[PDB]
Amino acid sequence: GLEALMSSGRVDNLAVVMGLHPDYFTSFWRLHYLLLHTDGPLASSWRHYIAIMAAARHQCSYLVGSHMAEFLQTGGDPEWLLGLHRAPEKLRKLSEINKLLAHRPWLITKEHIQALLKTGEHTWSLAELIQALVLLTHCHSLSSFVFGCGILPEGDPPSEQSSPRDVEALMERMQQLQESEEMESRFELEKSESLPDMLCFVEDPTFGYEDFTRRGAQAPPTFRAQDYTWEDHGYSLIQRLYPEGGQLLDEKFQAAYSLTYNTIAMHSGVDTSVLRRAIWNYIHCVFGIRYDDYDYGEVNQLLERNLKVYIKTVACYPEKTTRRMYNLFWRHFRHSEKVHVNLLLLEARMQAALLYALRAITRYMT
Numbered sequence: 303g304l305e306a307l308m309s310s311g312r313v314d315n316l317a318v319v320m321g322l323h324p325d326y327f328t329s330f331w332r333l334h335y336l337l338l339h340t341d342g343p344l345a346s347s348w349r350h351y352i353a354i355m356a357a358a359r360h361q362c363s364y365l366v367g368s369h370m371a372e373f374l375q376t377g378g379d380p381e382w383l384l385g386l387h388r389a390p391e392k393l394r395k396l397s398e399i400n401k402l403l404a405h406r407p408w409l410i411t412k413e414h415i416q417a418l419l420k421t422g423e424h425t426w427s428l429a430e431l432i433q434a435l436v437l438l439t440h441c442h443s444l445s446s447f448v449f450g451c452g453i454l455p456e457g458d459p460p461s462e463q464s465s466p467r468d469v470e471a472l473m474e475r476m477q478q479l480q481e482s483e484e485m486e487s488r489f490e491l492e493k494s495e496s497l498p499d500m501l502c503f504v505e506d507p508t509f510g511y512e513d514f515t516r517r518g519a520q521a522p523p524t525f526r527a528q529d530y531t532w533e534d535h536g537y538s539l540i541q542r543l544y545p546e547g548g549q550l551l552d553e554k555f556q557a558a559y560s561l562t563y564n565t566i567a568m569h570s571g572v573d574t575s576v577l578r579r580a581i582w583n584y585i586h587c588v589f590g591i592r593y594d595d596y597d598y599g600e601v602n603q604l605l606e607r608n609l610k611v612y613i614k615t616v617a618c619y620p621e622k623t624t625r626r627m628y629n630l631f632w633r634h635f636r637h638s639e640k641v642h643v644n645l646l647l648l649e650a651r652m653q654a655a656l657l658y659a660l661r662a663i664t665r666y667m668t
């Protein structure tokens with residue numbers, strides 16, 4: 303890790319834990335600095351305020367409190383911090399897609415995009431909108447990280463959970479896979495499986511992944527991954543509308559997806575890409591995205607049940623992560639590998655939310 307930085311006391315708790323993986327940290331930091339400390343379509347105070355709205359969806363006081371202070375240091379009108387109603391109508395129009403991005407991105411529709419781009423006194427342009435979608439999803443994914451790693455307040459360790467053999471069964475089952483129409487059914491099975499001051503910055507506070515207005519667990523509709531991908535569709539849309547941010551996102555997605563030390567717990571010299579692919583593809587499954595050429599049976603073979611409960615809680619209900627839940631899975635793995643799982647999951651989650659929003663923009667433009 304970036305040890306001298308981490309133990310210096312000069313960067314915040316979140317960045318300290320990110321430093322555990324220097325190759326991801328660089329990509330994280332570049333986007334962070336772009337969004338919050340580089341001139342762009344939106345003014346500094348608007349961007350911090352948009353981030354407060356995003357973090358409030360998950361009741362994340364670490365991130366709300368952090369952006370509240372920056373908003374004020376950068377010249378934001380303090381009255382906006384009394385709640386959304388005091389904020390410009392342009393910022394308020396973002397509430398619906400904030401909520402949907404955070405909890406049910408598959409519900410994002412071109413009619414949502416239409417309401418946003420609607421001609422009026424203060425209209426969203428496409429570069430402004432794209433920067434705001436990136437801001438919203440970035441702080442949603444960061445709320446996952448904050449809760450999943452037990453990141454402590456800056457007020458008076460950086461984590462309540464970290465502190466800066468079934469492994470052999472797992473390693474064996476990985477080797478089997480490498481050596482080698484129910485496939486649509488195995489996806490459906492994995493997807494249907496079920497496991498206060500901030501209130502003034504949101505609409506519909508109790509809206510979440512699970513729909514309690516209906517019986518039975520949450521099952522998003524199935525989306526065929528190939529219909530709209532990052533590599534072929536989404537990346538290209540963002541580099542056209544927000545060039546300086548698409549490249550940095552693409553680099554972050556690949557930095558996380560390919561990150562490896564070729565270690566598995568106490569063990570070395572192991573290809574772990576089947577395992578990491580299953581963590582990624584499970585999370586995308588949770589958001590309804592199906593990859594054709596993937597056997598979703600691999601998820602249950604590779605991801606123990608305590609790991610799936612943790613992954614799904616951190617991605618869909620981060621407020622509800624506990625130390626016990628963090629401790630219960632992968633008992634013999636290193637802490638850094640737990641942090642690694644959290645990186646994979648925030649990136650998988652963010653790409654899914656983004657792609658649904660980007661698909662909706664594309665459908666609107668046609």
Ligand SMILES: CC(C)C[C@H](N)C(=O)O
Nearest residue numbers: 562563564565574639642
């Ligand atoms: C266990 C996995 C999350 C990561 C593993 N430590 C690797 O280097 O690939």
